[PDB]
Structure formats: C-alpha cells, structure tokens
Amino acid sequence: AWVDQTPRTATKETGESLTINCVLRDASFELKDTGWYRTKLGSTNEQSISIGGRYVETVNKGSKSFSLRISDLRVEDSGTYKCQAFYVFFAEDVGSNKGAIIGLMVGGVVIGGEKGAGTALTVKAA
C-alpha cells in the first residue's frame, strides 16, 4: 500500500484556491477514515486541519480516494500539507503493517495510517 498525493508542489495567488488529491494505492484493505495536516512555512511542528469553513473534504471510499480544497488562500497558508488514509488490519497480517500504528483494539485489530508524500504550497502576496 502507499498513498499517492498530488500535486507535490503548488504556487497560487492570494485569493485563489488549492485542491490536493490523495488515493490509497495498491492496498488490500479498505479506506476507513481520513486526516489532513499542515506545517506552516518556517515551522517544524505539524498541526491537524479541522474540516469546515475554508477547508472542504471530498471522500470516495469506493475508489479509496479523497481530496481537500482550500479556498481564499493567503500568504500565511504557505507550507506543507499532508493527507493520511486510516485503515485496520489484524496483528499478524504482515502485508498490511508498513504504515504508522495509530491504536490497538481488543480482538487483535490494529489501526493503521498511511501518509502522502506532501504538497509544498507557496501563496504569493496580493
């Protein structure tokens, strides 16, 4: 499995919008949930993005794809954005274990996460 995140880089004018697309590729498991994150330019810590307002998400579990559209971009939006696909697998299913471990549910079910490679956004001054 891997998550294919596009575009890898983007430059936008202030006021415009950005769509980022992610698809969970080569995965035997289903897309159970999604997450979005960003790291502001000149910062090192990644914060989560709450869906709503300027951030609208579209999820198609059938094709294991998901997208985020960020509207009304400003300079302070510049930074790196990442998506994460969440899923489940059994403790001994080694084929499914290469993602991060998010939790462990009793009954031997592990919660896994695969992140996209990132989108580096530059939004230009007005």
Where does residue 123 rank: exposed (0-12), middle (13-18), buried (19+ CB within 10 A)?
buried
- CA gap 76, 123 in Å, rounded: 8
Residue count of the chain: 126
Which residues fall within 8 angstroms of residue 94, CB to CB, at 6 or more apart? none
Which residues fall within 8 angstroms of residue 51, CB to CB, at 6 or more apart? 36, 57
Deposited resolution, Å: 2.1
Strands (E), 14-91: 18-25, 33-40, 47-48, 55-60, 65-70, 79-90
Both tokens of residue 56?
Answer: 């609208």
Please give the radius of gyration of the chain, using alpha carbons only, rounded to the nearest integer. Answer: 16
Both tokens of residue 102?
Answer: 């998010």
Other beta carbons within 10 angstroms of residue 77's beta carbon come to: 19
Cis peptide before 7 (omega within 30 of 0): yes
Instruction: Answer whether 68's CB lies under 8 Å from 20's CB.
Output: yes
Cα dihedral 88, 48, 24, 32, rounded to 10, equals: 30
**For the chain, which domains are there?**
1-126 (2.60.40.10)
